[PDB]
Homo-oligomer: A and B are copies of this chain.
């Protein structure tokens, strides 16, 4: 049991500063105990047996209502449960063995439920605690989707294919047509139930543009891809020289490079806390599309800025030693999801190879800017 060995190490016994009257955002239901547990520094906690218990609620709680987020990126469903808590649903768009084609742009890529799930476990293994909990689930797409929605936009798209299977596609913009439909064999589809952050009415979230946002156009290169001194100016741009913000982007950009998720054009914050809180890692569906390719474009914020947190550097160095190592720690935790295997074996292997490239990018960068200038100590 290597996953226990990891959490015995002192690097995972870090305690937080004291939480004041602020730093709070606000035996209840599990989704609500998760909400009140959101504070300034994290989104849940390591100890917190609620997170393990919220993952079971997403698996087996009765679906009470199903609705469709209109005008979304791709198909996203909103599941609301018996105990009034809700969750976000991404259905299975690609099989387990498939890889994204090489000729696909980052903006033509599918969202796959494995990434939403695996990003939560990988984030929990990196002790970031920024992703809302997400569990995989098989849904009888008759009993749990079609027959329990009063959203006619979704019900009308249900049909039966010449293979006598039940299919549906919803109504988004990319990939919501009969020719991209989602078909069970014959009536269970599988997808990721992502726990919901508290209602935005009573917990506003500021939406930030990140300075390394790609140019969602072909031929047109982005600012940071042409300017090698791009980050000398970003550490002089408003909010990025006061945190724990420039550093919070370095946590996130190592997260994204590990998964190959090159679609981190924005990040959300909790508003009530200001420029000095954590970054909520949402929309992780674009990772784990390629396991035979390491997308170095994602790391460019790290080679240009050349500074990380010591907390996250030491854990990454640890996650490379053979006695712990990412692959084995992911194959254990991801073994407790219903959708096993949530990641095929080459994807867990890419976690190992991508990790030592991040450690090589820090060592190659620590021998050009030196320690202390590179490694902040928290």
Point out residues on A near B: beta carbons under 8 Å.
Answer: 1, 56, 59-60, 62, 96-97, 102-106, 108, 138, 159-163, 165, 167, 174-175, 177-179, 181, 183, 218-219, 322, 327-328, 331, 335-341, 344-346, 349
20 contacts between A and B (CB under 8 A): A1-B340, A56-B328, A59-B345, A60-B327, A60-B328, A97-B340, A97-B341, A103-B161, A103-B165, A103-B181, A103-B183, A104-B161, A160-B219, A175-B179, A335-B341, A336-B341, A338-B345, A338-B346, A340-B344, A340-B345
The residue of chain B having its C-beta at the shortest distance from the C-beta of A185 within the complex is B328
**Nearest chain-B residue to A62 (Cβ)?**
B322
A335 shortest CB reach to chain B, Å: 6
Q: A218-B159, A218-B160, A328-B60 are in contact. Are A103 and B167 (CB under 8 A)?
A: yes
Closest Cβ of chain B: how far from A111's Cβ, in Å?
13
Q: Which residues of the partner chain B approach A349 to less than 8 Å between Cβ atoms?
A: 138, 338
* Cβ contact within 8 Å between A179 and B108: yes
Q: Is B165 a contact partner of A340 (Cβ separation < 8 A)?
A: no
How far is B160's CA from A174's CA once the two chains are assembled, in angstroms? Answer: 21
Query: Do residues A174 and B165 form an inter-chain contact, with CB atoms below 8 A?
Result: no
Query: Which listed residue, B96, B104, B337, touches A162 by the CB 8 Å rule?
Result: B104
Which of B160, B161, B218 meets A102, CB within 8 Å? B161
- Known A-B contacts A56-B328, A327-B60, A340-B345; the reply to A335 vs B96 at CB < 8 A is yes
A96 partner residues in chain B, CB cutoff 8 A: 335, 340
Known: A60-B328, A138-B1, A177-B174. Contact between A163 and B102, CB under 8 A? yes
Contact present for B103 and A162 (CB under 8 Å) = yes
**Least CB distance, A91 to chain B, in whole angstroms:** 14
A72 to chain B, nearest CB (A): 15
